[PDB]
Design an enzyme around this catalytic site. Structure first.
Site, PDB file in Angstrom:
ATOM      1  N   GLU A   1      43.886 -21.968  40.362  1.00 42.29           N
ATOM      2  CA  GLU A   1      44.331 -23.156  39.761  1.00 42.29           C
ATOM      3  C   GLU A   1      43.843 -23.139  38.259  1.00 42.29           C
ATOM      4  O   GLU A   1      44.607 -23.818  37.276  1.00 42.29           O
ATOM      5  CB  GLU A   1      43.977 -24.242  40.346  1.00 42.29           C
ATOM      6  CG  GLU A   1      44.840 -25.439  40.347  1.00 42.29           C
ATOM      7  CD  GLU A   1      44.187 -26.532  40.816  1.00 42.29           C
ATOM      8  OE1 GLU A   1      43.926 -26.898  42.053  1.00 42.29           O
ATOM      9  OE2 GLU A   1      44.587 -27.750  40.106  1.00 42.29           O
TER      10      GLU A   1
ATOM     11  N   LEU B   1      39.936 -21.025  42.379  1.00 37.73           N
ATOM     12  CA  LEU B   1      39.941 -20.446  41.080  1.00 37.73           C
ATOM     13  C   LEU B   1      41.362 -20.003  40.450  1.00 37.73           C
ATOM     14  O   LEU B   1      41.371 -20.013  39.301  1.00 37.73           O
ATOM     15  CB  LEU B   1      39.242 -19.104  41.468  1.00 37.73           C
ATOM     16  CG  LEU B   1      37.667 -19.302  41.594  1.00 37.73           C
ATOM     17  CD1 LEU B   1      37.022 -17.943  41.855  1.00 37.73           C
ATOM     18  CD2 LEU B   1      36.976 -19.885  40.360  1.00 37.73           C
TER      19      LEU B   1
ATOM     20  N   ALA C   1      20.484 -13.869  29.070  1.00 42.48           N
ATOM     21  CA  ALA C   1      21.222 -14.872  28.913  1.00 42.48           C
ATOM     22  C   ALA C   1      21.644 -15.299  30.472  1.00 42.48           C
ATOM     23  O   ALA C   1      21.519 -16.645  30.869  1.00 42.48           O
ATOM     24  CB  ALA C   1      22.158 -14.581  28.177  1.00 42.48           C
TER      25      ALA C   1
ATOM     26  N   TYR D   1      15.524 -21.795  24.814  1.00 39.15           N
ATOM     27  CA  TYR D   1      16.548 -21.437  25.794  1.00 39.15           C
ATOM     28  C   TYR D   1      16.758 -22.385  26.924  1.00 39.15           C
ATOM     29  O   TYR D   1      17.748 -22.923  27.528  1.00 39.15           O
ATOM     30  CB  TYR D   1      16.418 -20.193  26.301  1.00 39.15           C
ATOM     31  CG  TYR D   1      16.659 -19.110  25.231  1.00 39.15           C
ATOM     32  CD1 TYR D   1      16.106 -17.754  24.999  1.00 39.15           C
ATOM     33  CD2 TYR D   1      17.954 -19.171  24.618  1.00 39.15           C
ATOM     34  CE1 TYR D   1      16.295 -16.855  24.397  1.00 39.15           C
ATOM     35  CE2 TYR D   1      18.251 -18.044  23.543  1.00 39.15           C
ATOM     36  CZ  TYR D   1      17.347 -16.916  23.502  1.00 39.15           C
ATOM     37  OH  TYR D   1      17.605 -15.610  22.593  1.00 39.15           O
TER      38      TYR D   1
HETATM   39  N1  LIG Z   1      22.003 -19.580  25.691  1.00 37.96           N
HETATM   40  C1  LIG Z   1      21.392 -18.606  26.059  1.00 37.96           C
HETATM   41  N2  LIG Z   1      21.472 -17.495  25.233  1.00 37.96           N
HETATM   42  C2  LIG Z   1      20.377 -16.671  25.507  1.00 37.96           C
HETATM   43  C3  LIG Z   1      19.422 -16.435  26.489  1.00 37.96           C
HETATM   44  N3  LIG Z   1      18.927 -15.401  26.723  1.00 37.96           N
HETATM   45  C4  LIG Z   1      19.373 -14.562  25.572  1.00 37.96           C
HETATM   46  N4  LIG Z   1      20.329 -15.159  24.924  1.00 37.96           N
HETATM   47  C5  LIG Z   1      21.391 -14.699  23.863  1.00 37.96           C
HETATM   48  O1  LIG Z   1      22.074 -13.558  24.406  1.00 37.96           O
HETATM   49  C6  LIG Z   1      21.873 -12.768  23.042  1.00 37.96           C
HETATM   50  C7  LIG Z   1      20.698 -11.494  23.601  1.00 37.96           C
HETATM   51  O2  LIG Z   1      21.165 -10.771  24.674  1.00 37.96           O
HETATM   52  P1  LIG Z   1      20.192 -10.802  26.096  1.00 37.96           P
HETATM   53  O3  LIG Z   1      20.828 -11.528  27.143  1.00 37.96           O
HETATM   54  O4  LIG Z   1      18.855 -11.450  25.786  1.00 37.96           O
HETATM   55  O5  LIG Z   1      20.099  -9.368  26.440  1.00 37.96           O
HETATM   56  P2  LIG Z   1      20.326  -8.499  27.768  1.00 37.96           P
HETATM   57  O6  LIG Z   1      21.575  -8.798  28.420  1.00 37.96           O
HETATM   58  O7  LIG Z   1      19.239  -8.706  28.783  1.00 37.96           O
HETATM   59  O8  LIG Z   1      20.169  -6.895  27.263  1.00 37.96           O
HETATM   60  P3  LIG Z   1      18.937  -5.932  27.127  1.00 37.96           P
HETATM   61  O9  LIG Z   1      17.846  -6.580  26.863  1.00 37.96           O
HETATM   62  O10 LIG Z   1      19.542  -5.195  25.832  1.00 37.96           O
HETATM   63  O11 LIG Z   1      19.129  -4.839  28.083  1.00 37.96           O
HETATM   64  C8  LIG Z   1      21.317 -13.541  21.858  1.00 37.96           C
HETATM   65  O12 LIG Z   1      22.731 -13.888  21.287  1.00 37.96           O
HETATM   66  C9  LIG Z   1      20.573 -14.695  22.628  1.00 37.96           C
HETATM   67  O13 LIG Z   1      20.678 -15.807  21.673  1.00 37.96           O
HETATM   68  C10 LIG Z   1      19.349 -17.890  27.283  1.00 37.96           C
HETATM   69  O14 LIG Z   1      18.457 -18.073  28.159  1.00 37.96           O
HETATM   70  N5  LIG Z   1      20.538 -18.739  26.972  1.00 37.96           N
END
Ligand SMILES: Nc1nc2c(ncn2[C@@H]2O[C@H](COP(=O)(O)OP(=O)(O)OP(=O)(O)O)[C@@H](O)[C@H]2O)c(=O)[nH]1
Ligand SMILES: Nc1nc2c(ncn2[C@@H]2O[C@H](COP(=O)(O)OP(=O)(O)O)[C@@H](O)[C@H]2O)c(=O)[nH]1
Ligand SMILES: [Mg+2]
EC number: 3.6.5.-
Lengths: 431, 432, 48
Positions: A247, A245, A12, A217
């Site tokens: 602020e 920051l 994410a 995504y």
């Molecule tokens: N907005 C958004 N949410 C995302 C994205 N990728 C994953 N998520 C959200 O994040 C959560 C999943 O976690 P991830 O970030 O994919 O996993 P990670 O941090 O890589 O961790 P591990 O794979 O377990 O090692 C879910 O709620 C997804 O909907 C993205 O590109 N955008």
């Protein structure tokens, strides 16, 4: 000079980072190779090399290589130096305990060494911007581990978060409520200000405002990036509000723990639409008080405000703003807590919002981001806490965390801290 | 998390395993020589999960073929894709197990086990990041059952942190090759409860019933049963071998599917049901595919899902279809059938869509359910076991190998505890 | 402290599995040796 280091953790965090840095480059006229044929404030986010190339002051971290491998093969592969794109081999498998303890402990020292090398290039480091999901094992587990270590190494240095609050429409793990509560408990004392982004709110804005049947995504992140850019525009351009920051904290955080502002953005208009009338300052300001434009699903009418920041961008005049605020007060209650003045801190940044070419967002002459600290945000914590309780009462999936060296007591502690946080939002709104 | 090390043990294990490799090779566009001749980049994106890349354009299955009997191995080599396998990876004995779990687990199997571990170690040390192991075997026989569970225990000893996955085929009186199958199955279930992270309960009772009742095959053959097994195995592994967000690796699948350590026995489901010859077929829409999740007729384990509750469900849709339609249809099923999903595990149904359909079909759906109804399969085995054990019938075949009666009593008791555990969570409420 | 804590807590349970798995090796050797000793003695019988 007041540099800001951006840290992108997990899928994410990395993917949102890609969207943010793409947008910053468009805003500052930086090409994907770091070249720019050129105010000077962009230097807070981009360092400069001997070849006149502009490099993001950022670190991308993931415990699995897949996501970052895309950055190092992608359009912006020349923008970042290889050493600032850090990957492990084994992911945290949607397990906070793996991310924080098992796997995280191996890469932590390497990540901090890279952060230290970026900090050494800073003359006036302001602090850190940390992007991560609540749901993933890396996003949850690694982030809290990193936040703790950053407090040790960077004594009283500002740390702000852009946290992805989980949504079932796009959720990848049944255990996301556990990871969310565990990361919130551990990070709470280490973060100065955290901006939550509810994936359902973003999913619904893309569906409703952008006419995207099944948002991806890529769609979600482009919208997220616009809000991040609104918050960071006054650090990257010679702004007047949220100039540093410290602020953000001063303006929005009345108590250390109540550091979760609600973001509301407007306008969100479809690009593949017939030419329409540009929205006035009154129209975009009215849109800030509509729950449909919120970044977190909750009801401010059922809560109380403790701070409100309005960040305008583009063709905006102070006279237009004040007139808009005056009309809002006549129609809406806009209830503030007893100990706070009923008011707004207003900022105008002259650059109009920039959009990605071939993107879903239409180009607008003026936009606005409202950051409000409302007690209504506690509703988001309650939803998460209830899902945690349902599973925890049966100890469902707990063995996965215990097996990694976590103790059951850490779950009780994390949940009690969340109960105290919910109680804090309730106590703060009383009179 | 990258490589999966595949192990095939016994007659059934090798037969089902060989079919798995010809099915997945066809999906990944790999011919019997190991050369990629496909025309889609998705086919190669996660090719490394099941194949090692050998010198040049060739792909070799990361598969170890095991039997105490040589004949089955010869049949595999002679087969369509027989030449794709690594020659050094065939590990076979000369003295079979004679459908005796004790021979496979303690005598003959113990003698061959080290030769197998030597080959698994070679494959494992070559791995950048070993996810774990995938074993295909029967529970009714001697090699697949006894040696297979011995291998699981020996591998668990050397790789205690890797995921242990199995495709375990349950015996049935309807398609039985030995009177002692209830003993072999019970002794094996005892081992799996303790030693695997995830087990796909592939029931010959259900496969026979599908062939006879649904496919209208008067006399089903192993070839007919194996066509359903290979369709299921292809479906349940879709997420591991193609790019995706959900259950992309063995650990993430286990974390999403297993709420309690011992409750790791999955009930697989498949739609549409087809026969080897049936290359017709003109049918199957999204609402049609979704409806077969609760359809007992589509279950690969002889249990009625409506007789229990789903703890967790993974549903994989394959082919060109609307993701919006899938999401709507899947939500409708959970709302309409509220009573068959536990309320104390929120958002316990996870859906994935893969653009690549399996061979012969334009549209398909695979279901992986962790249902409390799986207790029906274990009850059936326990009652068949007790009918024999009460009279100590055929016990001399096992005690003659050095086994004690206590092991039989223990295995049975452990399996009945598993049934009791499923019943406990079936009756549990979100009174919280 | 709260990390090598996990490190050490990890190990007890691995060492534990290895015990629960050395115990499973015990039995096998016992039941295979018992699978000879008995046949050894049936002939000890048979000759005399
Ligand atoms: N907005 C958004 N949410 C995302 C994205 N990728 C994953 N998520 C959200 O994040 C959560 C999943 O976690 P991830 O970030 O994919 O996993 P990670 O941090 O890589 O961790 P591990 O794979 O377990 O090692 C879910 O709620 C997804 O909907 C993205 O590109 N955008
Ligand atoms: N589905 C299926 N079951 C099989 C096959 N061959 C044998 N079985 C079943 O497996 C059990 C017998 O075990 P088997 O694998 O032949 O013995 P082993 O060689 O000692 O492992 C019984 O339940 C048989 O019905 C096969 O090709 N397919
Ligand atoms: Mg990840």
């Amino acid at each position: 000079m007041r540099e800001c280091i951006s840290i992108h953790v997990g899928q994410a965090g990395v993917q949102i980072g890609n969207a943010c840095w793409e947008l910053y480059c468009l805003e500052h006229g930086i090409q994907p190779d770091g070249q720019m044929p050129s105010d000077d404030s962009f230097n807070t986010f981009f360092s400069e090399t001997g070849a006149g190339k502009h490099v993001p002051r950022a670190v991308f971290v993931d415990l699995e290589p897949t996501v970052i491998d895309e950055v190092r093969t992608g359009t912006y592969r020349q923008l970042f130096h290889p050493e600032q794109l850090i990957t492990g081999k084994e992911d945290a498998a949607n397990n906070y305990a793996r991310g924080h303890y098992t796997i995280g402990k191996e890469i932590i020292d390497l990540v901090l060494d890279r952060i230290r090398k970026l900090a050494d290039q800073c003359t006036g480091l302001q602090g850190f911007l940390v992007f991560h999901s609540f749901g993933g094992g890396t996003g949850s587990g690694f982030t809290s581990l990193l936040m703790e270590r950053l407090s040790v190494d960077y004594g009283k240095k500002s740390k702000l978060e852009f946290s992805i609050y989980p949504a079932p429409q796009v959720s990848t793990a049944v255990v996301e409520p556990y990871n969310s509560i565990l990361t919130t408990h551990t990070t709470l004392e280490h973060s100065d200000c955290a901006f939550m982004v509810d994936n359902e709110a973003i999913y619904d804005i893309c569906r409703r405002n952008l006419d995207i049947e099944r948002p991806t995504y890529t769609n979600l992140n482009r919208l997220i990036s616009q809000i991040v850019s609104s918050i960071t525009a006054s650090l990257r351009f010679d702004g007047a509000l949220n100039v540093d920051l410290t602020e953000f904290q001063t303006n929005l955080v009345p108590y250390p723990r109540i550091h979760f502002p609600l973001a509301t953005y407007a306008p969100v208009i479809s690009a593949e639409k017939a030419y329409h009338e540009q929205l006035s300052v009154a129209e975009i300001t009215n849109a800030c008080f509509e729950p449909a434009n919120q970044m977190v699903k909750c009801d401010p009418r059922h809560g109380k405000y403790m701070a409100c920041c309005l960040l305008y961008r583009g063709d905006v005049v102070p006279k237009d703003v004040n007139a808009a605020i005056a009309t809002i007060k006549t129609k809406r209650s806009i209830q503030f807590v007893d100990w706070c003045p009923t008011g707004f801190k207003v900022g105008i940044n002259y650059q109009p919002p920039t959009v990605v070419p071939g993107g879903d967002l239409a180009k607008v002459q003026r936009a606005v981001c409202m950051l409000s600290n409302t007690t209504a945000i506690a509703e988001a914590w309650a939803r998460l806490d209830h899902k945690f309780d349902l599973m925890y009462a049966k100890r469902a999936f707990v063995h996965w965390y215990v097996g990694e060296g976590m103790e059951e007591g850490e779950f009780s502690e994390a949940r009690e801290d969340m109960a105290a946080l919910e109680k804090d939002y309730e106590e703060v709104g009383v009179d | 998390m990258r490589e999966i090390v595949h192990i095939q043990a016994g007659q059934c294990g090798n037969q089902i395993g060989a079919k798995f490799w010809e099915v997945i090779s066809d999906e990944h566009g790999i011919d019997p020589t190991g050369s990629y001749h496909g025309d889609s980049d998705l086919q190669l994106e996660r090719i490394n999960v099941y194949y090692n890349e050998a010198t040049g354009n060739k792909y070799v299955p990361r598969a170890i073929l095991v039997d105490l009997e040589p004949g089955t191995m010869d049949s595999v080599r002679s087969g369509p894709f027989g030449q794709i396998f690594r020659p050094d990876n065939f590990v076979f004995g000369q003295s079979g197990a004679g459908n005796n779990w004790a021979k496979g687990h303690y005598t003959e199997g113990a003698e061959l086990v080290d030769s197998v571990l030597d080959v698994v170690r070679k494959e494992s040390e070559s791995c950048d990041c070993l996810q774990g192991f995938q074993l295909t075997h029967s529970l009714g026989g001697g090699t697949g059952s006894g040696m297979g569970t011995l291998l699981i225990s020996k591998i668990r000893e050397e790789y205690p942190d890797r995921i242990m996955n199995t495709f375990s085929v349950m015996p049935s009186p309807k398609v039985s090759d030995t009177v002692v199958e209830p003993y072999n199955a019970t002794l094996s279930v005892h081992q799996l409860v303790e030693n695997t992270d995830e087990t796909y309960s592939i029931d010959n009772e259900a496969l026979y019933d599908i062939c006879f009742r649904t496919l209208k095959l008067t006399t089903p053959t192993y070839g007919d049963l194996n066509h359903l097994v290979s369709a299921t195995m292809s479906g349940v592994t879709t997420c591991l071998r193609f790019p995706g967000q959900l259950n992309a690796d063995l650990r993430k699948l286990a974390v999403n599917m297993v709420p309690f350590p011992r409750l790791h026995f999955f009930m697989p489901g498949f739609a549409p049901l087809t026969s080897r010859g049936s290359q017709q077929y003109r049918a199957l829409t999204v609402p049609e595919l979704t409806q077969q999740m609760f359809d007992s007729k589509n279950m690969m384990a002889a249990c009625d899902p409506r007789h229990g509750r789903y703890l967790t469900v993974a549903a994989i849709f394959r082919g060109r279809m609307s993701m919006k339609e899938v999401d709507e249809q899947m939500l409708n099923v959970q709302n309409k059938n509220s009573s068959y999903f536990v309320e104390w595990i929120p958002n316990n149904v996870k859906t994935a869509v893969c653009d690549i359909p399996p061979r012969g079909l334009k549209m398909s759906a695979t279901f992986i359910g962790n249902s409390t109804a799986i207790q029906e399969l274990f009850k059936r085995i326990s009652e068949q076991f007790t009918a024999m054990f009460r009279r100590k019938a055929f016990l001399h075949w096992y005690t003659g190998e050095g086994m004690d009666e206590m092991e039989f009593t223990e295995a049975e008791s452990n399996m009945n505890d598993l049934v009791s555990e499923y019943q406990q969570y079936q009756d549990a409420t979100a009174d919280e | 402290k709260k990390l090598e804590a996990a490190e050490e807590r990890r190990k007890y349970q691995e060492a534990e599995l290895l015990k629960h798995l050395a115990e499973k090796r015990e039995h096998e050797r016992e039941v295979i040796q018992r699978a000879i000793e008995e046949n050894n003695n049936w002939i000890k019988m048979a000759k005399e």
